[PDB]
Amino acid sequence: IRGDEVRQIAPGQTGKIADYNYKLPCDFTGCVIAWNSNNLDSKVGGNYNYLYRLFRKSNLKPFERDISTEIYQAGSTPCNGVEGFNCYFPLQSYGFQP
Amino acid sequence: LGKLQDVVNQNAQALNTLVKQLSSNFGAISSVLNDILSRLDKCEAEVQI
Amino acid sequence: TNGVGYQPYRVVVLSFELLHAPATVCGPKKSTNLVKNKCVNFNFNGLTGTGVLTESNKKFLPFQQFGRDIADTTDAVRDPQTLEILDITPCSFGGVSVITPGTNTSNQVAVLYQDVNCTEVPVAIHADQLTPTWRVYSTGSNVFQTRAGCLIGAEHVNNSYECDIPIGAGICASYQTSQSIIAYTMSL
Amino acid sequence: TGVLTESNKKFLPFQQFGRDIADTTDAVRDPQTLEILDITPCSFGGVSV
Amino acid sequence: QCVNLTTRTQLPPAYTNSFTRGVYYPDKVFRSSVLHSTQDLFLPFFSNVTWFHAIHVTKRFDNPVLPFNDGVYFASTEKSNIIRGWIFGTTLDSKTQSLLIVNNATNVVIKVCEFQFCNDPFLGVYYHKNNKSWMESEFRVYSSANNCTFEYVSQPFLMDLEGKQGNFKNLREFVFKNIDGYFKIYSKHTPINLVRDLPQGFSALEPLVDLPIGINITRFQTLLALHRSYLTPGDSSSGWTAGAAAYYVGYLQPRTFLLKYNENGTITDAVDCALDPLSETKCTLKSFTVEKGIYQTSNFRVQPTESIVRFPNITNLCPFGEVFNATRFASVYAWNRKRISNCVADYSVLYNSASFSTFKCYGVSPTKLNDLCFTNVYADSFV
Ligand SMILES: C=CC1=C(C)/C(=C/c2[nH]c(/C=C3N=C(/C=C4\NC(=O)C(C)=C4C=C)C(C)=C\3CCC(=O)O)c(CCC(=O)O)c2C)NC1=O
Ligand SMILES: *[C@@H]1O[C@H](CO)[C@@H](O[C@@H]2O[C@H](CO)[C@@H](O)[C@H](O)[C@H]2NC(C)=O)[C@H](O)[C@H]1NC(C)=O
Ligand SMILES: CCCCC/C=C\C/C=C/CCCCCCCC(=O)O
Ligand SMILES: *[C@@H]1O[C@H](CO)[C@@H](O)[C@H](O)[C@H]1NC(C)=O
Ligand SMILES: *[C@@H]1O[C@H](CO)[C@@H](O)[C@H](O)[C@H]1NC(C)=O
Ligand SMILES: *[C@@H]1O[C@H](CO)[C@@H](O)[C@H](O)[C@H]1NC(C)=O
Ligand SMILES: *[C@@H]1O[C@H](CO)[C@@H](O)[C@H](O)[C@H]1NC(C)=O
Ligand SMILES: *[C@@H]1O[C@H](CO)[C@@H](O)[C@H](O)[C@H]1NC(C)=O
Ligand SMILES: *[C@@H]1O[C@H](CO)[C@@H](O)[C@H](O)[C@H]1NC(C)=O
Ligand SMILES: *[C@@H]1O[C@H](CO)[C@@H](O)[C@H](O)[C@H]1NC(C)=O
Ligand SMILES: *[C@@H]1O[C@H](CO)[C@@H](O)[C@H](O)[C@H]1NC(C)=O
Ligand SMILES: *[C@@H]1O[C@H](CO)[C@@H](O)[C@H](O)[C@H]1NC(C)=O
Ligand SMILES: *[C@@H]1O[C@H](CO)[C@@H](O)[C@H](O)[C@H]1NC(C)=O
């Protein structure tokens, strides 16, 4: 993830990561380790291999995974699985410059 | 008949005091289950409850 | 170009209070039509809960939304959409007593619903939401009204005997010999 | 802390500990030598002076 | 490639009564001679469990897409091992990950995988002509498998996949549930000699697996193994005889139970609290025997079934772009303060662009900010 979102890896948090990508329980025995990975996952011109889900219908359950790439209908009209106005691709790319 | 009336009054007063005692927080953030369960998830609400 | 500790940080502090006064800043939820007189989970302006909603009369000054009783539990709430006062009651009540001959004899039982008329037992007990096995003990032919309450599952007998299982208000129940539970006024 | 003794208990393969009415652990499966050991307090009440 | 069955004689769904079934160990702890109380997802006693069966001569082979509701009790009576797998998922369309448990007569395989499932999948069995035995040359479950994040191909084995005629000999009971991304399966196999609906007896379903699939499950279906021999006419869509097996599906609900652990550590009896007044008294008194008398009993009988939300109808999105996307902030000594009212604090708009180094909330759990209304909102802004 990015640094600013490391705080979201904890029980009872909210945000992109703690709602749409990775959720932790509060009956959670275990522990969390995070370390800066610059000059290992960031390259010149931007590293776009790492993605994160930006739009979802509802929040995730704890330890639930969602790899679906279906188009997110933000507005009223169904856009029928093609990108367009008021429909977005739910996965966005981190831009990790060094 | 002060004795019998005293008995009845004692019982009624005890029950009313028991009802009144539900307003005490006992260290929790509130004395109402609904407020605790709405402000906090079970994560933090378990200890208060 | 200075260190991260010296870099500028923009800060906003959002101060508010909850569940104590009328609210205009709401979350991104969608309301639902009102279902009254049913054990239901409700959420009024973020105050969640479960119970039975009914209509009543209360004079709420414009700066008041909730009302609290002696026990401090919220009892009256102003509905934000349709401006009216609704009273919350628990969707159950104490006063259910189970009469039985002891196991190793039979599994039949009787139920005494205390201080309820036999006409209004189902609404009081919310038998619509109860299991099928609880509904047979809610209404039938063995329904008997007493000064204590309504007794179900035992046939009323005009005869009088000694007290085997005391019930109340001069009523005692026993296990006759097909085999069934009887309820009768005691013999002094 | 306590006193370990040997005993007889049928532990299914997914069970390691055993708990009594008071919820304190009373039987433990020794990981190295597969056997059940009972833990008792190393003292007892009943001493009068 | 996959073939859709065309010959069907369908009846309305059948029901039966599940009595004192579906009890499982709730923990991996040994307790002996103890009356232990618990609350969890359990199958209520004396429940209307749905009945399905495959028998021939009326050419039913029923296997619909049933719904999954926070836990399921499955129980199959069989002798020839017809009922031989399950498919779980949310849409079963390859747009979402789906779970597949299949015993293909040599291995039991568990896959969490984006499957383009058939419409009426069947695992197949075939009485071979080149040799007088049973073995299957058809595996008709899915058409594609991509982005495939789990695998439990087991050790090889061999099983009596033959078609036996007579009386049932195996009752296999399973409890599935999905909690915190963990698929818990409890299992029990017992020999029974009955050709009826659910037998008389108490089971003690042991924990089988706790798989980490981490998916959303709302529907399933069963994978039945087609019989096929040289005594049936027609093509694959007609030339198949049904099996001779039956299954039953329940639906777990949150219930409080009493359980009795015997001297050897096994569950032998239980009480469904909130079933009938007598069980309610056994449950309140914490015993399996009640002597003659009258007992005051607590309130477990009624449980909630629906939820209501009643919020003000306000449509004006809240000024997030004026406090966060402000051209200029205030100096900390003259810190700005802004009243906020008549809002819908969706705050998902900030996800697109704004990233916050610190976001700490006091007096409120962050998860509950979507389920609340705030009275006197002030934004104090500075640098
Ligand atoms: C489908 C998933 C599947 C599961 C979960 C499974 C579990 C399972 N099956 C077993 C035996 C066995 N399992 C089967 C067959 C089955 N058992 C079933 O759950 C099903 C659906 C069938 C086929 C219809 C048989 C025939 C035995 C041996 C019975 C015996 O030898 O008496 C055992 C005990 C193994 C041992 O004691 O060494 C386990 C744990 N086997 C499977 O194939
Ligand atoms: C798991 O899958 C189900 C089915 O897709 C989701 O429930 C549906 O969500 C949509 C909105 O996204 C609603 O229109 C449907 O009415 C819902 N159906 C039911 C029965 O609730 C569910 O949201 C998914 N669970 C999670 C955590 O994402
Ligand atoms: C215009 C301000 C409205 C104020 C509403 C007040 C309280 C309800 C919303 C609370 C959270 C504020 C947004 C913080 C988003 C953090 C998500 C993240 O990036 O991790
Ligand atoms: C919206 O709110 C108003 C008053 O606040 C109320 O009269 C009305 O019933 C609500 N619902 C709709 C659809 O307007
Ligand atoms: C309910 O019972 C009370 C006293 O028994 C009686 O006054 C009242 O009329 C009854 N109401 C009905 C509808 O029967
Ligand atoms: C459900 O079970 C009850 C008995 O507990 C029975 O009265 C009822 O008819 C059953 N309903 C269905 C649809 O099976
Ligand atoms: C008891 O007496 C009343 C009238 O005195 C009568 O109506 C009633 O039928 C009697 N009970 C039975 C079971 O017959
Ligand atoms: C090591 O473990 C095995 C079984 O786990 C046990 O039999 C053995 O006694 C232990 N000690 C040594 C030295 O191997
Ligand atoms: C089965 O037949 C084809 C595939 O062979 C499929 O497109 C169709 O949807 C299926 N028929 C029905 C009634 O579902
Ligand atoms: C099906 O059975 C065959 C037997 O050779 C085995 O190779 C295979 O692993 C089984 N299917 C899967 C998906 O493993
Ligand atoms: C999911 O499958 C599609 C099919 O091409 C592929 O493009 C995509 O990269 C896969 N995503 C993951 C996380 O495997
Ligand atoms: C407990 O296990 C032993 C040996 O397996 C057996 O003799 C005994 O019968 C079992 N206890 C009961 C009540 O059956
Ligand atoms: C805030 O500013 C950024 C950059 O101009 C823009 O991408 C984003 O849409 C804005 N978000 C809001 C809520 O105004």
XYZ file of N, CA, C and O and ligand atoms in Angstrom, chain D residues 10, chain E residues 262-266 268, ligand 12:
42
model
N -9.550 -39.662 26.792
C -9.650 -39.892 25.352
C -9.720 -38.529 24.676
O -10.767 -37.879 24.670
N -20.527 -35.884 28.057
C -20.513 -37.088 28.877
C -19.129 -37.274 29.496
O -18.257 -36.408 29.404
N -18.916 -38.422 30.139
C -17.639 -38.677 30.801
C -16.494 -38.817 29.805
O -15.357 -38.459 30.125
N -16.761 -39.338 28.611
C -15.717 -39.552 27.618
C -15.434 -38.318 26.770
O -14.515 -38.357 25.945
N -16.194 -37.241 26.937
C -15.936 -35.999 26.243
C -16.767 -35.746 25.007
O -16.482 -34.785 24.285
N -17.783 -36.562 24.744
C -18.623 -36.430 23.565
C -19.949 -35.785 23.939
O -20.434 -35.929 25.063
N -23.791 -35.838 23.873
C -24.817 -36.869 23.806
C -26.228 -36.319 23.731
O -27.095 -36.974 23.152
C -16.131 -44.450 27.192
O -14.994 -45.152 26.476
C -14.789 -46.524 26.953
C -13.759 -47.180 26.062
O -13.911 -46.701 24.751
C -16.079 -47.343 26.933
O -15.844 -48.589 27.589
C -17.216 -46.642 27.628
O -18.430 -47.389 27.396
C -17.408 -45.253 27.136
N -18.438 -44.556 27.992
C -19.874 -44.783 27.750
C -20.909 -44.080 28.610
O -20.217 -45.512 26.888
